[PDB]
Amino acid sequence: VLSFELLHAPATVCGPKKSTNLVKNKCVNFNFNGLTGTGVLTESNKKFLPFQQFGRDIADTTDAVRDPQTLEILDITPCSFGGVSVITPGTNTSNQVAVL
Amino acid sequence: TLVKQLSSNFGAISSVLNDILSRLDPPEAEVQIDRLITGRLQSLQTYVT
Amino acid sequence: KPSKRSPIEDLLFNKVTLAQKFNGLTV
Amino acid sequence: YQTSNFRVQPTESIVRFPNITNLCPFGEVFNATRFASVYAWNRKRISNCVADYSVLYNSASFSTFKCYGVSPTKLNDLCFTNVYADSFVIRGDEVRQIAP
Amino acid sequence: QCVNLTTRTQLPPAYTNSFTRGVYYPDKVFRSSVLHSTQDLFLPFFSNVTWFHAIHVTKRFDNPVLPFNDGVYFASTEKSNIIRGWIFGTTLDSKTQSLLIVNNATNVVIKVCEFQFCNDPFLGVYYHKNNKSWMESEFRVYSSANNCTFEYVSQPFLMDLEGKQGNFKNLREFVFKNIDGYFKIYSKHTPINLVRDLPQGFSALEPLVDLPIGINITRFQTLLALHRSYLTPGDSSSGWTAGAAAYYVGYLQPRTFLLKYNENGTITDAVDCALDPLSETKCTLKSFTVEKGI
Ligand SMILES: *[C@@H]1O[C@H](CO)[C@@H](O[C@@H]2O[C@H](CO)[C@@H](O[C@@H]3O[C@H](CO[C@H]4O[C@H](CO)[C@@H](O)[C@H](O)[C@@H]4O)[C@@H](O)[C@H](O[C@H]4O[C@H](CO)[C@@H](O)[C@H](O)[C@@H]4O)[C@@H]3O)[C@H](O)[C@H]2NC(C)=O)[C@H](O)[C@H]1NC(C)=O
Ligand SMILES: *[C@@H]1O[C@H](CO)[C@@H](O[C@@H]2O[C@H](CO)[C@@H](O[C@@H]3O[C@H](CO)[C@@H](O)[C@H](O)[C@@H]3O)[C@H](O)[C@H]2NC(C)=O)[C@H](O)[C@H]1NC(C)=O
Ligand SMILES: *[C@@H]1O[C@H](CO)[C@@H](O[C@@H]2O[C@H](CO)[C@@H](O)[C@H](O)[C@H]2NC(C)=O)[C@H](O)[C@H]1NC(C)=O
Ligand SMILES: *[C@@H]1O[C@H](CO)[C@@H](O)[C@H](O)[C@H]1NC(C)=O
Ligand SMILES: *[C@@H]1O[C@H](CO)[C@@H](O)[C@H](O)[C@H]1NC(C)=O
Ligand SMILES: *[C@@H]1O[C@H](CO)[C@@H](O)[C@H](O)[C@H]1NC(C)=O
Ligand SMILES: *[C@@H]1O[C@H](CO)[C@@H](O)[C@H](O)[C@H]1NC(C)=O
Ligand SMILES: *[C@@H]1O[C@H](CO)[C@@H](O)[C@H](O)[C@H]1NC(C)=O
Ligand SMILES: *[C@@H]1O[C@H](CO)[C@@H](O)[C@H](O)[C@H]1NC(C)=O
């Protein structure tokens, strides 16, 4: 017979499991231990101290992660977006347009 | 300062949208989403002016 | 010389010392 | 003329946070030779460890899996502080008596 | 096994000054060439730290019991592993849970059991030339251990266990915190060459250990070695010498600091935000250099 119990103390018994293979150079929705986000993971040349986990930059936006299994430093850049615009030579003169 | 204003509670329990979306059900999370919305909108208005 | 700037223009350009693509920003 | 905005969408892929190592030694209690007398029932403490409850019941011949409280499914997600296990041998027909 | 030894030359407490020491990485976040503002527990700059001593000369080894207000900055200055470990708790009477971080002879044992500690606990060794090893004949720290909720043992190791009579060559700094049911230990080691006091420098403390013990801690004490030898004849309570060692105790308070990260993610400088008006100005401008003006 087992006995589960909770109290005003840290919890130190449970089992998670993700172990999902990673993919680089693709707009992917990532979730490392705790933090989450969306981006295109890529290899980097930054140097982390042995105890540090995930880097940062000015204005406090995540910019690097270290995966638990292989201990590698991966950059993070936001997934591409922008605003489309149309060039027209005037309706009366012609019909064809160009797209920027 | 506009960018740094993004991570503020504004009166909501969490400053990240996904946590409110997940950990608590919609019919009550609408209020927290509304609070974040109004805070961010006011910040943007001040910046534009 | 590089580009076509006169020496005073180059001195002015070097003397002046200077965000990026983020969540919603654009330049 | 500006007309709209374009935004790349993620490919739904996800990313890891794992590595297990220090698995709990449940086989100590289940695979012990002589368990206990009923009145001399043990009080075994398990803490500061990861326990794979899923393998205990997902593929096993251990009959009478009546786990009261949380569902047997979605049981590895929850986390507790301490685990108390009591082991003893009783009669065949007395299994129904041990219940709330 | 509680010996209750005596014959220590009484002296008043002494004090000294800590010159910009006690800076530890608050979290695990990496940074590069950026100044950061942090609000957390710190040891204020140029603060008064108590200084406990242990030299025979006058017998004179010092190891009282101390309070644990919010956090402790321990700094050991010795060369012969004379200091061994620590002891935490609330009542220290086997009635309440306690922690027993100790180096020990073999493994750095960590326990949370309930111990009936001796009123004057310590560890020691016995010296004799025949067996060149200084065997640990002392285990006089507690008397009983009823039940526990955690334990740890590390890999086997041995120490020099030799009481050289030179100058101090090693400085070991430790920072202990206990909040939110968690217990955190930060540590660093630095070679030195001094005769007294703390050298004026800057070494940033690195995280070492985190533990989910979640116990109440209010009272503090330390445990150090005692190399008894045949040259000090007597009973258990009379024959011993204290070698040469000293340790420095400070305290932590809530504060605001400005930390300078170099290009490789290591702290190289810090500035207090409440010491001097100049320091407050530098905190306000987020810079170390300010120009002429108001
Ligand atoms: C008390 O002690 C006993 C005796 O050791 C334990 O019983 C063993 O339990 C382990 C648990 O995994 C068993 O290990 C498994 O053995 C399989 C052998 O084939 C059996 O299963 C197939 C169906 O899969 C049957 O068709 C076949 O007839 C056999 O009955 C392996 O194939 C398994 O490996 C598979 O999964 C791994 C997962 O990574 C893959 O990598 C493999 O390639 C493979 O696909 C698995 O290893 C073992 O068979 C049991 N018996 C023995 C004699 O060891 C009890 O578990 C233990 N009690 C506790 C509480 O620990
Ligand atoms: C948990 O973490 C450990 C260590 O981070 C993982 O073990 C490591 O696994 C990788 C690949 O599975 C091993 O890489 C191989 O190393 C050999 C060494 O010569 C090299 O020649 C190969 O080309 C390859 O790179 C790595 O060695 C291994 N670590 C050690 C110390 O052996 C482990 O896979 C992680 N997961 C689990 C479930 O344990
Ligand atoms: C060491 O000395 C202390 C104090 O002198 C002793 O502590 C006393 O222990 C007795 C029980 O033996 C209690 O009744 C007292 O209340 C304790 N305090 C005092 C002030 O007397 C301790 O027992 C001594 N230990 C040894 C081994 O001599
Ligand atoms: C079409 O519009 C252009 C732009 O003003 C003008 O130059 C041209 O004469 C117009 N042609 C006709 C047929 O309206
Ligand atoms: C520290 O202690 C010394 C001597 O005890 C004393 O003169 C001084 O005022 C104390 N405080 C500071 C901040 O130095
Ligand atoms: C040396 O150690 C042995 C135990 O192996 C012990 O019997 C002996 O008394 C020791 N010698 C001295 C001088 O302490
Ligand atoms: C230890 O045993 C005592 C009774 O002897 C009991 O009251 C206490 O709760 C136990 N504590 C632990 C941590 O096992
Ligand atoms: C620790 O101290 C707090 C202070 O209120 C108290 O509530 C709690 O019960 C104490 N814990 C133990 C184990 O004594
Ligand atoms: C940072 O580390 C690199 C090697 O990884 C080293 O060459 C460089 O000198 C270090 N930075 C400084 C300021 O020394």
Q: Is residue E294 part of a domain?
A: no
Q: Is residue E32 part of a domain?
A: yes
> Of E241, E250, E248, whose CA–CA distance to E61 is shortest?
E241
Task: Read off the CATH number of the domain in which E135 is found.
Answer: 2.60.120.960
Q: Are strands E125-127 and E204-211 parallel, antiparallel or unpaired?
A: unpaired
> Of D72, D92, D70, D83, whose CA–CA distance to D42 is shortest?
D83
Q: Give all chains having 3 or more CB-to-CB distances under 8 Å with chain D.
A: A, E
**Chain D residue closest to E214 (CA)?**
D81
Residue B9: partners with Cβ closer than 8 Å, 6 or more residues away? B15
Residue B10: how many other CB atoms lie within 10 Å: 15
Residue E188: how many other CB atoms lie within 10 Å: 16
**Cα–Cα dist D64/E16, whole Å:** 69
**Cα–Cα dist E149/A87, whole Å:** 73
Query: Quick check: E22 and E43 in contact, CB under 8 A?
Result: yes
Query: Quick check: E223 and E41 in contact, CB under 8 A?
Result: no
Distance from CA of E125 to the nearest CA of D (A): 34
- Domain hosting E134: range is 14-285
**Cα–Cα dist E138/E127, whole Å:** 12
Query: Quick check: E184 and E209 in contact, CB under 8 A?
Result: yes
Q: Is residue E291 part of a domain?
A: no
- Kindly state whether E12 is in contact with chain D, defined as any CB-CB distance less than 8 angstroms: no
Q: Do C19 and A59 touch (CB under 8 A)?
A: yes
**Cα–Cα dist D47/D30, whole Å:** 17
Q: Is residue E202 part of a domain?
A: yes
Q: Do E30 and A64 touch (CB under 8 A)?
A: yes
Would you say the C-alpha torsion A4, A8, A14, A18 has a positive or negative sign?
Answer: positive
SS (H, E, C) A33-64: CCCEEEEEEEECCCCCCCCCCCCCCCCCCCCE
Q: Is residue E190 part of a domain?
A: yes
**Cα–Cα dist E257/A13, whole Å:** 37
Say yes or no: CB of residue E130 within 6 Å of ligand 6.
yes
Q: Is residue E2 part of a domain?
A: no
Q: Give all chains having 3 or more CB-to-CB distances under 8 Å with chain E.
A: A, D
**Cα–Cα dist E160/A16, whole Å:** 44
Say yes or no: CB of residue E119 within 6 Å of ligand 3.
yes
For residue E9, count CB atoms less than 10 angstroms from its CB and return exposed for 0-12, middle for 13-18, buried for 19 or more: exposed
**Chain A residue closest to C22 (CA)?**
A78
Number of domains in chain E: 1
Which of E97, E112, E149, E183 should be substituted to probe chain D, the one whose Cβ sees the most D Cβ atoms within 10 Å? E149
CA of D79 to the centre of ligand 8 (A): 23
Ligand 7 site: residues with CB under 6 angstroms? E 146-147, 149
**Cα–Cα dist E164/E171, whole Å:** 16
Q: Is residue E8 part of a domain?
A: no
For residue E206, count CB atoms less than 10 angstroms from its CB and return exposed for 0-12, middle for 13-18, buried for 19 or more: middle
Q: Is residue E4 part of a domain?
A: no
Q: Which residue out of D24, D29, D30, D31 has the highest number of ligand 1 atoms within 8 Å of its CB and is therefore the one to mutate?
A: D31
Q: Do A82 and C22 touch (CB under 8 A)?
A: no
**Cα–Cα dist E72/E99, whole Å:** 15
Of all protein residues, whose CA lies closest to atom 8 belonging to ligand 7?
E147
**Chain D residue closest to E211 (CA)?**
D48
Q: Which of residues 1-27 of C touch B (CB under 8 A)?
A: 19, 22-23, 25
Strands lying side by side in the sheet with E83-89: E65-67, E219-224, E83-89
Distance from CA of C12 to the nearest CA of B (A): 29
Give A28's strand partners. A39
Please name the amino acid found at residue E2: C
For D30, the 3-state DSSP assignment is helix
DSSP code, position D50 = B
Distance from CA of B5 to the nearest CA of C (A): 13
Distance from CA of E178 to the nearest CA of D (A): 18
Say yes or no: CB of residue E131 within 6 Å of ligand 6.
yes
Tokens of C11: 């001195």
**Cα–Cα dist E19/E198, whole Å:** 8
Of all protein residues, whose CA lies closest to atom 8 belonging to ligand 4?
A93
CA-based max dimension of chain D = 86
**Cα–Cα dist E172/A91, whole Å:** 80
Give E99's strand partners. E88
Q: Which residue out of D30, D58, D65 has the highest number of ligand 1 atoms within 8 Å of its CB and is therefore the one to mutate?
A: D30
Query: Quick check: E112 and D48 in contact, CB under 8 A?
Result: no
CA of E113 to the centre of ligand 7 (A): 10
Give me the resolution in angstroms, 1 decimal: 3.5
DSSP character string of B10-49 = TTSS-SSHHHHHHHS-HHHHHHHHHHHHHHHHHHHHHHH-
**Chain B residue closest to C20 (CA)?**
B3
Residue C19: partners with Cβ closer than 8 Å, 6 or more residues away? A59, B3, C25
